[PDB]
Design a protein around this nucleic acid. Structure first.
Ligand SMILES: [K+]
Ligand SMILES: [K+]
Ligand SMILES: [K+]
Ligand SMILES: [K+]
Ligand SMILES: [K+]
Ligand SMILES: [K+]
Ligand SMILES: [K+]
Ligand SMILES: [K+]
Ligand SMILES: [K+]
Ligand SMILES: [K+]
Ligand SMILES: [K+]
Ligand SMILES: [K+]
Ligand SMILES: [K+]
Ligand SMILES: [K+]
Ligand SMILES: [K+]
Ligand SMILES: [K+]
Ligand SMILES: [K+]
Ligand SMILES: [K+]
Ligand SMILES: [K+]
Ligand SMILES: [K+]
Ligand SMILES: [K+]
Ligand SMILES: [K+]
Ligand SMILES: [K+]
Ligand SMILES: [K+]
Ligand SMILES: [K+]
Ligand SMILES: [K+]
Ligand SMILES: [K+]
Ligand SMILES: [K+]
Ligand SMILES: [K+]
Ligand SMILES: [K+]
Ligand SMILES: [K+]
Ligand SMILES: [K+]
Ligand SMILES: [K+]
Ligand SMILES: [K+]
Ligand SMILES: [K+]
Ligand SMILES: [K+]
Ligand SMILES: [K+]
Ligand SMILES: [K+]
Ligand SMILES: [K+]
Ligand SMILES: [K+]
Ligand SMILES: [K+]
Ligand SMILES: [K+]
Ligand SMILES: [K+]
Ligand SMILES: [K+]
Ligand SMILES: [K+]
Ligand SMILES: [K+]
Ligand SMILES: [K+]
Ligand SMILES: [K+]
Ligand SMILES: [K+]
Ligand SMILES: [K+]
Ligand SMILES: [K+]
Ligand SMILES: [K+]
Ligand SMILES: [K+]
Ligand SMILES: [K+]
Ligand SMILES: [K+]
Ligand SMILES: [K+]
Ligand SMILES: [K+]
Ligand SMILES: [K+]
Ligand SMILES: [Mg+2]
Ligand SMILES: [Mg+2]
Ligand SMILES: [Mg+2]
Ligand SMILES: [Mg+2]
Ligand SMILES: [Mg+2]
Ligand SMILES: [Mg+2]
Ligand SMILES: [Mg+2]
Lengths: 82, 99, 212, 194, 97
RNA sequence: CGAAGGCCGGGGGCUAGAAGGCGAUCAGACACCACCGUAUUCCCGGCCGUAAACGGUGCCGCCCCGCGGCCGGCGCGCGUCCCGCCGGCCGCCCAGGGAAACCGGGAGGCUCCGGGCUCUGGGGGGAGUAUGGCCGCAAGGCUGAAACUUGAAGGCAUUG
RNA sequence: UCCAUUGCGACAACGAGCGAGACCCCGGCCGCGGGCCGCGGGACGGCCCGCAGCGGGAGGACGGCGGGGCGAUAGC
């Protein structure tokens, strides 16, 4: 939601994205973060439009190379592999 | 002289790619097809052109290029008759599929 | 008039992009400075020359003298920038430095010491930063407190829009470019740190993204 | 099963005597002379996953296909020919993603490389401008700045050609361009280097 | 004077002291794991006369005896006589023979 | 307990060789280079207690991306090899650290500072000196100031 | 590799400029014009041999054209 006033108004300038793998805030100036999306076929081997599944990965996890494992784990658990 | 400057060589490339047909392996003739604000400059650039021709002989070498890299032959190159997967791929294919 | 040379700068041209908080949300670089000037029209951005240093290159026929200059920008309400430039003449050095100072803009998170009555008036939480042998600590302060800093740091904290604040500095802070770099990195770290105010999970919708 | 037979003729399932820890999940057995063997089922699942990642992009000309290896050069000009991706054949020139004054400068959304030790400049440069990447990876591959690996043999020409052929087929299937459950009119031989 | 080599200019690993060898050129005392060492194998007659010796021998099947000598020099003599060369900072890390 | 040199009392004495002698070189050469040579170099019984005695890096304990090499012990495997485990010695190196060189089996997990214990430093000189004390046959060692003087000394790194 | 940061080819660099060269002047051989002067041609590492170019031969007035002019940035 963000930080709030004494009345209820969220006085936060903008909401940074979180890493889909490590829960860390992305933050600007991080030009190694990658947000990418996936098809979700649901129809006999052909995609359908405007219905995707999106994830975030910060430069900290890319730099050592844990995405090939973490993103496979995430997609297995969101129903894109087994 | 011995060495030709990049001005000469840059000229020689465009000139020969633009008149591949007209150029023979001699110098007198190649002068005409080069005939630049000076006649010695003309002489040097034509001197390099006369060499580029008998070096390119040993466009007309690009039209067949796109016709060669497209022909798919009548066979398949994998039309294999006998399996050789007797070792660790044997148990690999047992633990994937039919065999 | 000016012509874009990057796709983001082209999307700037139309009514496509509105503000800096989306460009920072999806953390892309900004390569043209009129991208900035479209969002920040006509002197909402303040601009100050911290220092001109003269640097010398020893050569067979004597020395070779050039100029380095450092420049700060800020809108008094949440953006700061710091740049440097090197040239044969002071005018050009400053011109380079100001342009880089404006392509180096970041947002800044502010919050509430103690009571949350009014607007954010001090740094959201403690900030730490480092550049060279310099290290800086920004600590939240109660209202009326002011800007406890050196004259160099106070100017950056003034352009950023941080009303009250206690600061601490270690290392050779007479090295002015490193001092300003430390304070700059401290203000840039403001939007990286998890706080319970932002813990909660959300759904990412590919529609909203600006397609890198 | 037919594609399994093709993978066996091309030998797409043999490694290079060294194994990285992150590729350990894709290994099945070890040959006595030391060569490693991939589980082909996992290879096909990575191929399908990469296909389902490729089709989210509306215009395919903003997918970059980079491959410096001679033995792959032909194979990358054909992948584009049926998918309309953008190939960078030879030496990758530094600056192509970071320097806008370059004549072949571009701003793609997916980087697809052939090898992670060859083509290292493209992988390192893509990390400065927010591009995710997919790589063909062998058993000794280092997965730094790579999001989706594809276990495979990336040296012998048959392997490389068959791999790009399979990828292009599944993409053309998913988009609806070519029919499903039917052998593509394109023979894989058009991808292999003579 | 910062440190120039990770090996401190010698190959001494897990011990306190190593033997002494005299330099062959100048006869200086050098520790064994620092001395520059080479092995040479050469005939005792030059090959420009090995043919004449081999024609003028009497023994049917005779062969030229070889020589096996290990040369060991200090750093000064090695550099002066060009057994080893001073190298670039990058090149110093190369161990190829 | 303690390298080498040194000292006291016995023995021994090939090599090399402080000192001493002598041939050259030189402006001079009492030095480097050539030759001869005493202590010393070796053994036995003591003493002395220092070295760039160095990884210029104190000891115990935890966590720590990876790829190799060698050394000792063990176990599973197929048919010497091969995969692991413990302990040691080494190379390269992501992150992180740092003024950098570089470290990385730490010099990391530290201005986001707190696992336990012992020793040492506080601008450059004067000075490790004077003085007192303990130890030593001596040579020394260990402990160790003050007056006075000075704007720098010094680290790593860049171009010439 | 060349008289030459002249070039070939390789490269966290890609793409330009000056200096170099090109240019000007003189002098060799040949044509049209005028009455020697003044307008053009000619020479290029072109030919044939041996291994970007180093060699050997041939023809030609001249063989790698010859003597000069000009001359970067930074300065004392
Ligand atoms: K990067
Ligand atoms: K020093
Ligand atoms: K040494
Ligand atoms: K060792
Ligand atoms: K040892
Ligand atoms: K030893
Ligand atoms: K040696
Ligand atoms: K020496
Ligand atoms: K003792
Ligand atoms: K002792
Ligand atoms: K001793
Ligand atoms: K003695
Ligand atoms: K003796
Ligand atoms: K002595
Ligand atoms: K003397
Ligand atoms: K002397
Ligand atoms: K003697
Ligand atoms: K003595
Ligand atoms: K004696
Ligand atoms: K001695
Ligand atoms: K002795
Ligand atoms: K002693
Ligand atoms: K000491
Ligand atoms: K010391
Ligand atoms: K040492
Ligand atoms: K201690
Ligand atoms: K062993
Ligand atoms: K062992
Ligand atoms: K051992
Ligand atoms: K062993
Ligand atoms: K063993
Ligand atoms: K072992
Ligand atoms: K172990
Ligand atoms: K161990
Ligand atoms: K041990
Ligand atoms: K080591
Ligand atoms: K160790
Ligand atoms: K303790
Ligand atoms: K102690
Ligand atoms: K101490
Ligand atoms: K001490
Ligand atoms: K001390
Ligand atoms: K102390
Ligand atoms: K005294
Ligand atoms: K005494
Ligand atoms: K005595
Ligand atoms: K005494
Ligand atoms: K005494
Ligand atoms: K210094
Ligand atoms: K010092
Ligand atoms: K010093
Ligand atoms: K430095
Ligand atoms: K310095
Ligand atoms: K280069
Ligand atoms: K270079
Ligand atoms: K470089
Ligand atoms: K006339
Ligand atoms: K005339
Ligand atoms: Mg003697
Ligand atoms: Mg003697
Ligand atoms: Mg002695
Ligand atoms: Mg010591
Ligand atoms: Mg060892
Ligand atoms: Mg006393
Ligand atoms: Mg420095």
């Amino acid at each position: 939601i963000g930080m709030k006033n004494s009345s209820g108004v969220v006085v936060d300038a903008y909401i940074p994205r979180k890493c889909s793998a490590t829960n860390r805030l992305i933050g600007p100036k991080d030009h190694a973060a990658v947000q990418l999306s996936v098809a979700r076929v649901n129809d006999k081997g052909k995609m359908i439009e405007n219905n995707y599944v999106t994830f975030a990965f910060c430069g900290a996890i890319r730099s050592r190379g844990g995405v090939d494992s973490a993103f496979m784990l995430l997609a297995q658990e969101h129903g894109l592999m087994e | 002289g011995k060495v030709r400057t990049k001005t000469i060589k840059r000229a020689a490339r465009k000139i020969v790619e633009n008149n591949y047909e007209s150029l023979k392996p001699k110098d007198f003739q190649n002068n005409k097809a080069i005939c630049i604000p000076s006649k010695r400059l003309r002489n040097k650039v034509a001197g390099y052109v006369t060499t580029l021709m008998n070096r390119v002989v040993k466009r007309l070498q690009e039209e067949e290029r796109e016709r060669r890299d497209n022909y798919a032959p009548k066979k398949s190159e994998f039309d294999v008759e006998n399996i050789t997967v007797s070792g660790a791929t044997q148990q690999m294919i047992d633990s994937i599929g039919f065999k | 008039e000016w012509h874009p040379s990057t796709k983001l700068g082209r999307l700037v041209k139309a009514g496509k992009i509105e503000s800096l908080y989306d460009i920072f949300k999806y953390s892309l670089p900004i390569k043209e400075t009129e991208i900035i000037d479209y969002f920040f029209p006509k002197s909402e951005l303040a601009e100050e020359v911290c220092n001109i240093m003269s640097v010398q290159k020893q050569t067979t026929a004597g020395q070779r003298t050039r100029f380095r200059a450092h420049v700060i920008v800020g809108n008094r309400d949440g953006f700061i920038g710091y740049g440097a430039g090197v040239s044969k003449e002071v005018a050009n050095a400053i011109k380079k430095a100001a342009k880089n100072a404006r392509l180096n803009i970041v947002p800044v998170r502010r919050g509430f010491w103690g009571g949350k009555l009014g607007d954010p008036h001090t740094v959201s939480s403690k900030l730490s930063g480092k550049c060279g042998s310099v290290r800086v600590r920004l600590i939240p302060a109660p209202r009326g407190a002011g800007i406890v800093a050196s004259p160099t740091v106070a100017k950056v904290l003034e352009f950023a829009g941080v009303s009250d604040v206690f600061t601490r500095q270690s290392g050779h802070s007479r090295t002015l470019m490193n001092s300003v770099g430390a304070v700059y990195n401290a203000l840039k770290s403001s939007y990286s740190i998890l706080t319970p105010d932002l813990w909660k999970k959300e759904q990412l919708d590919h529609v909203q993204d600006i397609r890198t | 099963e037919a594609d399994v037979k093709k993978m066996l003729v091309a030998t797409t399932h043999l490694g290079v005597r060294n194994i990285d820890r992150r590729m350990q999940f894709y290994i099945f057995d070890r040959q006595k002379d030391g060569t490693f063997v991939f589980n082909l089922q996992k290879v096909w699942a990575k191929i399908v996953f990469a296909a389902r990642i490729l089709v989210t992009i509306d215009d395919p000309a903003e997918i970059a296909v980079v491959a410096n290896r001679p033995d792959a050069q032909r194979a990358i000009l054909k992948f584009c020919k049926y998918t309309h991706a953008t190939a960078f054949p030879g030496r990758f020139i530094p600056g192509n993603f970071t320097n806008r004054m370059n004549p072949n400068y571009c701003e793609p959304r997916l980087l697809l490389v052939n090898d992670p030790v060859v083509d290292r400049q493209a992988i390192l440069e893509a990390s400065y401008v927010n591009i995710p990447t997919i790589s063909l990876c062998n058993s000794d591959a280092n997965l730094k700045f790579i999001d989706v690996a594809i276990p495979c043999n990336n040296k012998t020409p048959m392997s490389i050609g068959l791999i790009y052929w399979l990828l292009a087929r599944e993409v053309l299937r998913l988009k609806g361009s070519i029919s499903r459950t039917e052998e593509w009119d394109v023979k894989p031989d058009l991808f292999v280097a003579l | 004077m910062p440190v120039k080599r990770r090996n401190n200019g010698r190959s001494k690993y897990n011990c306190g002291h190593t033997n002494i060898v005299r330099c062959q050129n100048c006869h200086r005392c050098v520790p064994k794991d620092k001395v520059i060492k080479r092995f040479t194998i050469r005939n005792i007659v030059d090959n420009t006369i090995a043919d004449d010796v081999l024609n003028a021998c009497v023994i049917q099947g005779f062969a030229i005896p070889k020589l096996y000598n290990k040369v060991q020099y200090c750093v000064s003599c090695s550099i002066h006589n060009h057994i080893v060369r001073v190298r670039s900072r990058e090149d110093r890390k190369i161990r190829t023979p």
